[PDB]
Copies of this chain bind each other. A is one copy, B any other.
Amino acid sequence: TKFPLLSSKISGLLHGADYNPEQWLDHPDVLVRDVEMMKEARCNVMSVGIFSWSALEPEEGRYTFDWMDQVLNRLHENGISVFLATPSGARPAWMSQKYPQVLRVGRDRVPALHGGRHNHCMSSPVYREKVQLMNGQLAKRYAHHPAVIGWHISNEYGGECHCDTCQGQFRDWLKARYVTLDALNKAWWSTFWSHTYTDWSQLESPSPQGENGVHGLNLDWRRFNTDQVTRFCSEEIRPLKAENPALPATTNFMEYFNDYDYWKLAGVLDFISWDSYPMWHTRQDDIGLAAYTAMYHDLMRTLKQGKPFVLMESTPSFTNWQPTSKLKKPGMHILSSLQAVAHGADSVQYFQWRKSRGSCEKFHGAVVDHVGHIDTRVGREVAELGSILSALAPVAGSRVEAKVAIIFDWESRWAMDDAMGPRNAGLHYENTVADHYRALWAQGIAVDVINADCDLQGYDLVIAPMLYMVREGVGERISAFVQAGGRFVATYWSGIVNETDLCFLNGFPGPLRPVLGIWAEEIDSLTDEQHNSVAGVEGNALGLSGPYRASQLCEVIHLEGAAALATYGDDFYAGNPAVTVNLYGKGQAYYVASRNDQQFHADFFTALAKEMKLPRAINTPLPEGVTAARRTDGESEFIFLQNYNADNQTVALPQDYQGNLPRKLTLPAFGCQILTRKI
């Protein structure tokens, strides 16, 4: 009926920040003020210890935990929970100097020097052992500290190491996966360019001066790295769990992060967390950007089948590392933070409570500016959001009931982006997926963002833009899902290769060819100056009309059972099917042969939602840039109405919600209103 909260100790939404009091121990007045202001702002959680290695172990084997004892006791005394971090995000300088193997070797084989962060070798037995020791200390000292509600494992795991140890490890991994060199060579088609591996010691990680044209290799390298960090993360976790199995562990994920398959890494965590820094107010409007963000929130919720996630980081204002450091306009901080909550966040947390005074993130936004207090515009909006969050306790643990699934698949992505062709100028996978998402999000229809391994049975509608790789089982599951009454939508450049990037030989859409009822003979590629158009067939079942712009990729297809919903208007393939639907069992499978404009997706998916009677957050038309999200505890529903436009927008309510809101609602620019009601 409702998910358990992050801890039995908490009873609503969390509000908080990364906290680095270790930078300020020379000013105890700052530490006392920090806490007074936390409570003023209604922050009830902080993440502590993240970059504290040198503050915990300034010399090898010599520890100094006192400041942390103090910090944890003070937060506890003041009713503030802690996510305690393991400090593996940044080794001390002494450790680098004494054990250089903890440093990485780059893809270009350049050895790193000490510095930066998140740049440890993941094979290094020394570093893994020091992590065990450090984590063992933190656990035996703090796993029963009443403040502590969970573990923040490392920080923002990322990157790759090509040192000789990592090469050895990679060779072993390959040898476990394919059992003979025979299997490997076949899987990679290595006879091409006489790349035949005749001994295991010949295998090597990719490099610009060596080999980076063997797709199978590049792909498995990414899988291998995923397994490296997943094992690294498990090992970090275990000494912690040994002292207290009841404390949950997470690690903080990044925006559409490419290095690791988060579906794999997620299987080692108790709950999901991520870090979101959208470049608000940098484009024509914030609508697209909002939908892109919202889709990733959904992904984060989907990784544990609806279980709420933590927004571990975000800025209250601007960042320090983007081309511009734009201020969030008044209201937008509430709106962006509530958007996380709207799609399943049970905590809104920020990077930095208090701005660092020196170093590279001193101009990153925080709750407490350099001016030393929170009587600033930023501070006041943070505090105001604190109030709002504390007033949303019933939303904590509530579920998102999505009947729509969109596939975003890391392995497909990796093999697609690595491939040479069919548009080396850019495929824009993230963006394309999101373009599909946007037409649903515009209607306030809930979406889960699964990968191709997830079970399709609970859904009415499954959408797979550019599912380039169709692994074993996937086409069968899809086919079964449609047959049983499901509806499927796939696009151009789906069903092309298998697990190791070998093309199918049965004609393209491959394992999906029978369900889609079409053959994709060839794909045309378009420059950024070129276009085609798609126009609906009179009487077509979705009422598509247009014409709509088609850009970048246009496939030439042949009907094999499917009927044409729309045709191309231009080029040598003019008059040919552009959009099709196929009847398969009691379901229907749609195919979209070209990359089309926003209007196309809006027409296509609003028709398809009307026909399928998909549930919406509110049953009323939403103006452009206004969206709606719904969470429920089984007893009430909570509707998040959001206005990403930069002017006022008015919505008509189809029923009564809670006192009681008027029948007709003006949302301010960047406004948000939460409507509640019994089901």
Contact = CB atoms under 8 A, between A and B. Distances in A.
B194 A54 contact: yes
A190 B359 CA distance: 7
A196 B55 contact: yes
Contact of A360 (B106, B213, B506, B572): B213
What DSSP secondary structure best describes chain A's contact surface? loop
Given A198-B93, A360-B215, A505-B372, A23 B192 contact: yes
Contacts of A106: 209
Interface string A50-77: 0111110011000000000000000000
Contact of A358 (B92, B187, B202, B363): B187
Interface in A351-366: 355-364
A363 B420 contact: yes
A326 B420 contact: no
A87 interface: yes
Contacts of A207: 113, 115
Contact of A522 (B89, B116, B317, B322): B317
B362 A503 contact: yes
A421 B204 contact: no
Given A114-B204, A198-B93, A213-B116, A503 B320 contact: no
Nearest to A520: B371
Contacts of A521: 369, 371, 376-377
A670 to B, nearest CB: 10
Given A92-B196, A191-B55, A522-B378, A114 B202 contact: yes
A650 interface: no
B424 A322 contact: yes
A329 interface: yes
Contacts of A201: 97
Interface stretch (A436-444, A523-531, A608-616): A523-531
A412 interface: no
A655 interface: no
A500 interface: yes
Nearest to A501: B358
A32 interface: no
B324 A425 contact: yes
Contact of A114 (B114, B189, B210, B326): B210
A51 B363 CA distance: 46
A318 interface: yes
A194 B53 contact: yes
Contacts of A115: 195, 204, 207, 210-214
A371 B94 CA distance: 59
A7 interface: no
Nearest to A323: B425
A371 B507 contact: yes
Interface in A527-579: 527, 556, 571-572
Contacts of A109: 113
A99 interface: no
A603 interface: no
A438 B193 CA distance: 38
A526 B329 contact: no
A131 to B, nearest CB: 13
Contacts of A199: 93-94, 97
A91 interface: yes
A256 interface: no
Interface in A580-632: none
A108 B370 CA distance: 34
Contacts of A370: 503-505, 507-508
A52 B54 CA distance: 53
A372 to B, nearest CB: 6
B326 A189 contact: no
A329 B571 CA distance: 9
Interface of A: 20, 22-23, 26, 51-55, 58-59, 87, 89-94, 96-97, 106, 108-117, 186-199, 201-202, 204, 207, 209-216, 282, 317-327, 329-330, 355-364, 369-372, 376-378, 419-425, 500-508, 521-527, 556, 571-572
12 contacts: A53-B194, A55-B191, A55-B196, A59-B198, A93-B197, A94-B198, A116-B210, A189-B356, A190-B358, A214-B359, A324-B525, A376-B521
Given A55-B194, A216-B358, 4 more contacts: A115-B210, A115-B214, A282-B527, A362-B503
10 tightest A-B CB contacts, nearest first:
A189-B358, A115-B211, A113-B210, A363-B421, A54-B196, A192-B359, A90-B194, A213-B360, A320-B420, A323-B425
